Amino acid sequence: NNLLRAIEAQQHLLQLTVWGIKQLQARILAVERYLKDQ
Amino acid sequence: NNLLRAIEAQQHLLQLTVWGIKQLQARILAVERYLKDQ
């Protein structure tokens, strides 16, 4: 019960890390491309 | 019980990914700024 609530909050945590990781990958990709284009 | 111990260890895992993600965001930000300044 509280155990299920933990797991749900962990799932919210995870989805936040997924969000950050996709932000970072797009941003690093845009930098690599910029350097390549230069 | 072992179930709770799993969730705790998963929580430690998560906090480690949060640490890495903040390191990476500061570092990518410093690179973007460097390129902008150049």
Binding site: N2, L3, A6, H12, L13, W19 | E8, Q11, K22
Partner: peptide, 24 residues
């Protein structure tokens, strides 16, 4: 969402989880 809102949501849910771990 911004990285400031992200930082805060992270902390909010880290706190919730830690209280759910003690309650259990």
């Amino acid at each position: 969402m911004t990285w400031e809102e992200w930082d805060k949501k992270i902390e909010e849910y880290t706190k919730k989880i830690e209280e759910l771990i003690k309650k259990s």
